[PDB]
Design a protein around this ligand. Structure first.
Ligand SMILES: Cc1cc2nc3c(=O)[nH]c(=O)nc-3n(C[C@H](O)[C@H](O)[C@H](O)COP(=O)(O)OP(=O)(O)OC[C@H]3O[C@@H](n4cnc5c(N)ncnc54)[C@H](O)[C@@H]3O)c2cc1C
Ligand SMILES: Cc1cc2nc3c(=O)[nH]c(=O)nc-3n(C[C@H](O)[C@H](O)[C@H](O)COP(=O)(O)OP(=O)(O)OC[C@H]3O[C@@H](n4cnc5c(N)ncnc54)[C@H](O)[C@@H]3O)c2cc1C
Ligand SMILES: CCCCCCCCCCCCO[C@@H]1O[C@H](CO)[C@@H](O[C@H]2O[C@H](CO)[C@@H](O)[C@H](O)[C@H]2O)[C@H](O)[C@H]1O
Ligand SMILES: CCCCCCCCCCCCO[C@@H]1O[C@H](CO)[C@@H](O[C@H]2O[C@H](CO)[C@@H](O)[C@H](O)[C@H]2O)[C@H](O)[C@H]1O
Ligand SMILES: CCCCCCCCCCC1=C(C)C(=O)C(OC)=C(OC)C1=O
Ligand SMILES: CCCCCCCCCCC1=C(C)C(=O)C(OC)=C(OC)C1=O
Ligand SMILES: [S]
Ligand SMILES: [S]
Lengths: 421, 421
């Protein structure tokens, strides 16, 4: 309303949950902050591969949201948005109720585009997913069925994927868990299929010696690896794979039987968002300026995987660059600042800062991690690390981030760099 | 004087130069800041290996100090301190004049202890040094004489050394320069001798895969490498080397002829400082608290290589852990803050923060670098990197640091982390 704006945050995920707390903190009791999300629970996404192999339980990485945001003065609606009318500024929910907003911050993350590859939906066949806790639990279940009746395994990333790390993580921990159970030698074949032009490209043209280390890692585990691949369909428990050359011409086709599989799908924008006329690129990603503000609607901001980021490269098989946690938090922070400035006469000048990618993977006793910035080479920082300490660090962050989501955020998150003083 | 303290900074090096500017900045026109140093010029120490092989010139990495500090209100005395009387608070200079101080900040760096190994002084034989620009120029001269009359090369680090990176850097760029000149095959033998218990220990129990990468690096260049070594003497153009086992027992002795050599010496405290009764440990390093204040004299602070840091390990051949730039700058910053607090009633609470080590080495087209913290494993950060970008980064820092030394320091130096916004 006039003088008491209603700010709606769409999606309670890695960007959206912190955004709710930071928004309420920044605005105070004079304005209304409402968080709207498809699920009634928060989940720590980087832990999903471990759930998918059974090293973690849902209850470890997920919790109900309502009480934690409400104790902070934030309204929570556990309902999916089905339609957004940007002209009238009304959101229509699954149940048919509509919610008016003065500002909308979209943090809806990715739509998992299984439709790109007929038969690839985890409910349609043997190729599973570890992108969500619902999918990871399902993947483990299928993993157990593999144990009962051993057969070929196929893990990897689809054409158009942007999130490659989890594919490698999952393959390594599956190989490890097989050994730990003494079942590894019952597997007919273990294949790694990726849309990357080479092993360890990671959608970022490689980082440190990611290529040499991931290549040798897969070999060590007796995992056969193919690059420049796209899966055309999954059918009759078989994966149909087409491999191209640098010029995108077929150098071979393969038909791989799968008893158990997991392929990272391409990400698109969610339908309710993609469906807003003139808001998104053809992929369904919100077109924003450096201040995180929609280029079409002044009262619409966006953050996280939901936003569009121009490609810097064009690979033989389409691939994308990942949008990761540190950059997402900078996006959120910028959006909150600029919305507040809008509510106070100023035009917020805050930006996301320099593009970067940061990823951690835990293999059990030790981990791998990388930092790359900015996007194009030669970089200012281009590092890949492996060791027991990386494992200890992922463990620590998960427990920290989760506690933070229950307690509140009133400061710049990554003051985590207090381990210097 | 009363109400207008005289603050003396001893040593215009990596810690001492910034300390002068930061001290004057912090204190203002009400107090007197005097910088006293053995040489009339500043030198960028990490560039010395390159001078030693002729890839850089003195004029590139060194400049006269007087004008730059004086334009800032700082007094400069280009004279070595020979005696410090801590009771009377008088410094006696080489010329015999004495300077009274109310506060003394010691930043005198290392004494290069060539005396530990008879015949090792660069002026006494074939084993040279790249620790100072005077020594690096001399080393290059000897390098040219090697070119005219090829013979065995020996590079490495002595017992008690704490600065291992430069040894590896120097060996690699010597090997490279030999190739570039087409002289590499005229060398009878190229040996690497170190006091480290293994290749890439670096005085820090290794960092990332420093071991595997430095080992393979030396092999690639046909450099034969021996660890757990100490040099007992240099004599008749021969290096007498004793190699021990884990229990410090001799497993072999070697006599190596040297036409051209470079060994990093052990560091001790400088005589004028070590000579202050009750100030130093037996090595000549100033015993300080967490606030950088002498444990014996309240008006004496210290920073940089000059301070004592307890060992965390005890290797078969004595070795030390390096004191590097980021930590040194934190020491300086802490000292300046706490002296100012002293001049204003408060007890300064500022500390150096977490122990860390950071080193960059440039091989020509690409570089190697590491970050380790804290001192003991498992660490919070333990990373080793290599690439063209590391080279570009060392180049950039040298030019930045040098400009900063000419222009002044009024802020926390490493706001260099502005490459994020
Ligand atoms: C398996 C995996 C591992 C990863 N590991 C790392 C890592 O180690 N480090 C790192 O920095 N990044 C990692 N990422 C990348 C990244 O950070 C995450 O994907 C992160 O959760 C994305 O943040 P987000 O807020 O943009 O999307 P999300 O976290 O997916 O949140 C989006 C949310 O909005 C909701 N939603 C969607 N549509 C609607 C609708 N119509 N109405 C209401 N709500 C809706 C969702 O249900 C959800 O809560 C990983 C990603 C995956 C898939
Ligand atoms: C070859 C080499 C390469 C290195 N590379 C790196 C690197 O890449 N990164 C990193 O973080 N560190 C590096 N270091 C380690 C370190 O940072 C440096 O040694 C640094 O210069 C030390 O700072 P300092 O102020 O303690 O000593 P110094 O820089 O040596 O300054 C000490 C000073 O005080 C003076 N002095 C000594 N005695 C007296 C006296 N009696 N009276 C008056 N003045 C006196 C000196 O002449 C000198 O100016 C390197 C060191 C060496 C030797
Ligand atoms: C999170 C980013 C995305 C990546 C996710 C996928 C992770 C895949 C894991 C592959 C690693 C397996 O291979 C592993 O590589 C490391 C690094 O060279 C080796 O480890 C080597 O370097 C490390 C430090 O970096 C040393 O501590 C070690 O002593 C040395 O042998 C291991 O000997 C090898 O077992
Ligand atoms: C500054 C810290 C102290 C150390 C100073 C001494 C430096 C010594 C240099 C030795 C490096 C030589 O060996 C070199 O190692 C790197 C890293 O594995 C290899 O490079 C490998 O990893 C890098 C990234 O990390 C990739 O860009 C590269 O494609 C890959 O091959 C090179 O193929 C090899 O030539
Ligand atoms: C962009 C410049 C470097 C950023 C600093 C990275 C280190 C601080 C925490 C990083 C981090 C960790 C440890 C981590 O485990 C993790 O996985 C959940 C991340 O993703 C959100 C992280 O961003
Ligand atoms: C302790 C935690 C990490 C510190 C941040 C390191 C990166 C910023 C500059 C580092 C640096 C560079 C690049 C460098 O080239 C260099 O050599 C002269 C150093 O020594 C003084 C450095 O400290
Ligand atoms: S990734
Ligand atoms: S070093």
């Amino acid at each position: 309303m006039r003088g008491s704006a209603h700010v709606v945050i769409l999606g309670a995920g890695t960007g959206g949950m912190p955004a709710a707390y930071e928004m309420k903190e920044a605005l105070g009791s004079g304005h209304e902050v409402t968080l709207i999300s498809a699920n009634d629970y928060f989940q720590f996404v980087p832990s999903n591969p471990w759930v998918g192999v059974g090293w973690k339980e849902r209850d470890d990485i997920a919790f109900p949201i309502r009480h934690y945001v409400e104790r902070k003065g934030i309204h929570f609606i556990a309902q999916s948005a089905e339609q957004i009318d940007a002209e009238a500024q009304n959101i229509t929910l699954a149940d048919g109720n509509t919610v008016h907003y003065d500002y909308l911050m979209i943090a809806t993350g990715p739509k998992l585009a299984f439709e790109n590859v007929p038969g690839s939906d985890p409910h349609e066949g043997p190729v599973q997913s570890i992108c969500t806790v619902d999918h990871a639990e399902r993947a483990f279940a299928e993993y157990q069925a593999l144990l009962r009746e051993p057969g070929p395994i196929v893990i990897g990333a689809m054409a158009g994927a942007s999130c490659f790390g989890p594919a490698y993580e999952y393959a390594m921990i599956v190989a490890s868990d097989l050994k730990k159970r003494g079942m590894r030698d019952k597997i007919p074949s273990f294949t790694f299929i990726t849309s990357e032009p080479y092993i360890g490209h990671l959608g970022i043209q490689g980082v440190g010696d990611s290529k040499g280390i991931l290549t040798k890692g897969l070999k060590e585990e007796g995992i056969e690896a193919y690059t420049n691949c796209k899966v055309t369909k999954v059918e009759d428990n078989k994966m149909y794979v087409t491999q191209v050359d640098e010029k995108g011409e077929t150098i071979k086709e393969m038909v791989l039987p799968v008893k158990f599989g997991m392929m990272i799908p391409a990400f698109k924008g969610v339908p309710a968002v993609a469906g807003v006329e003139g808001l998104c690129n053809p992929g369904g990603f919100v077109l924003v300026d450096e201040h995180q503000r929609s280029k079409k609607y002044a009262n619409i901001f966006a953050a996280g995987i939901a936003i569009a980021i121009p490609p810097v490269e064009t690979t033989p098989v389409p691939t994308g660059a990942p949008k990761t946690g540190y950059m997402i938090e900078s996006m959120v922070s910028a959006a909150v600042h600029n919305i507040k400035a809008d509510l106070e006469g100023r035009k917020g000048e805050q930006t996301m800062g320099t593009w970067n990618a940061v990823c951690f993977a835990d293999m059990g006793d030790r981990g791998a991690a990388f930092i790359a910035l900015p996007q194009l080479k030669p970089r200012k920082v281009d590092v890949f690390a492996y060791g027991r300490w990386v494992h200890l660090a992922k463990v620590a962050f998960e427990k920290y981030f989760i506690r933070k989501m229950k307690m509140g955020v009133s400061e710049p998150f990554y003051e985590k760099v207090l381990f210097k003083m």
